[PDB]
Scaffold this active site. Structure first.
Site, PDB file in Angstrom:
ATOM      1  N   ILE A  89       0.796  -1.220   0.000  1.00  0.00           N
ATOM      2  CA  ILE A  89       0.000   0.000   0.000  1.00  0.00           C
ATOM      3  C   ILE A  89       0.825   1.265   0.000  1.00  0.00           C
ATOM      4  O   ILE A  89       1.815   1.337   0.770  1.00  0.00           O
ATOM      5  CB  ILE A  89      -0.884   0.040   1.266  1.00  0.00           C
ATOM      6  N   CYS A  90       0.469   2.233  -0.841  1.00  0.00           N
ATOM      7  CA  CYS A  90       1.073   3.563  -0.824  1.00  0.00           C
ATOM      8  C   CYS A  90       0.042   4.553  -0.305  1.00  0.00           C
ATOM      9  O   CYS A  90      -0.905   4.921  -1.012  1.00  0.00           O
ATOM     10  CB  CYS A  90       1.574   3.948  -2.239  1.00  0.00           C
ATOM     11  N   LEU A  91       0.219   4.995   0.942  1.00  0.00           N
ATOM     12  CA  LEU A  91      -0.762   5.881   1.588  1.00  0.00           C
ATOM     13  C   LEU A  91       0.064   6.773   2.565  1.00  0.00           C
ATOM     14  O   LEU A  91       0.838   6.210   3.347  1.00  0.00           O
ATOM     15  CB  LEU A  91      -1.742   5.073   2.409  1.00  0.00           C
TER      16      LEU A  91
END
EC number: 2.3.2.23
Lengths: 198, 75
Positions: A89-91
């Site tokens: 995940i890229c958050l």
């Protein structure tokens, strides 16, 4: 687990949350030491993830809470900020916008919010982000197909299903076939060429 | 024995072969029957591209099995 008291308390907070009572989020124990948890979030309505449920691996690193929990989707998903291969995940809040006072409930709801609205300027998965921008309609149908295949959502494109069946009939692995077609604009010729490249 | 060869558009042909035929021999039979040059052919079975030097028996390809023909791309 030095942070065990806090993780137990945050775990209980999710268990007792309003959002769990509304079946939006949930969490489950994995190990007896609270260093690994299993989250789940509902696809928001009026997105292509609607009707799906997505399981999350949550690992608490020894440097928590100064560094964030490491979270990855267990359930495969087609989204610009999630790897179509790994679930990574890229958050913002999971990398450099993490603050030590953030809770497990906050992380779960931030992920459900991510499903409502992609951030394609800062993507995890360039192939998916490119499609999201270049062909929003195919992106929507592709996400819906992955929500049906992997997350339990209602039926998706019968034409996509038939292409998947045709390639599985050659003996390719189903997951490899799905990601090859989704990554190649559902073009059977080029998805097959990718499959033959490994 | 007879085996089937299917293309990406679902068109199916029938080929008479021997278990001892190499995949190279099979590509030549496809050329004889359909006109496709061997150098343009790739034959797939059980999710793998077959190698020219091995036999149908080596790959457990048997009577009425289906091989998948995937032509090489323009490039």
């Amino acid at each position: 687990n030095i942070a065990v008291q806090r993780i137990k308390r945050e775990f209980k907070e999710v268990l007792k949350s309003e959002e769990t009572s509304k079946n939006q989020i949930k969490v489950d124990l994995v190990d007896e030491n609270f260093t690994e948890l299993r989250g789940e979030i509902a696809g928001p309505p009026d997105t292509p993830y609607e009707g799906g449920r997505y399981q999350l691996e949550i690992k608490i690193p020894e440097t928590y809470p100064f560094n964030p929990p490491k979270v990855r989707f267990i359930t495969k998903i087609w989204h610009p900020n999630i790897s179509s291969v790994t679930g990574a995940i890229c958050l913002d809040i999971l990398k450099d916008q993490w603050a030590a006072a953030m809770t497990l409930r906050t992380v779960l709801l931030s992920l459900q919010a991510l499903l409502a609205a992609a951030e394609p300027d800062d993507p995890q998965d360039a192939v998916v982000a490119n499609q999201y921008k270049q062909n929003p309609e195919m992106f929507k149908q592709t996400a819906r197909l992955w929500a049906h295949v992997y997350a339990g959502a209602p039926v998706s494109s019968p034409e996509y299903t038939k292409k998947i069946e045709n390639l599985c009939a050659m003996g390719f692995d189903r997951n490899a076939v799905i990601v090859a077609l989704s990554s190649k604009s559902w073009d059977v010729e080029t998805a097959t060429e990718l499959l033959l490249s490994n | 024995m007879q085996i089937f060869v299917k293309t990406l558009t679902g068109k199916t042909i029938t080929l008479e072969v021997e278990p001892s035929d190499t995949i190279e021999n099979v590509k030549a039979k496809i050329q004889d029957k359909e006109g496709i040059p061997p150098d343009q052919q790739r034959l797939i079975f059980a999710g793998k591209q077959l190698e020219d030097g091995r036999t149908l028996s080596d790959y457990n390809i048997q009577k009425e099995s289906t091989l998948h023909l995937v032509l090489r791309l323009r490039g």
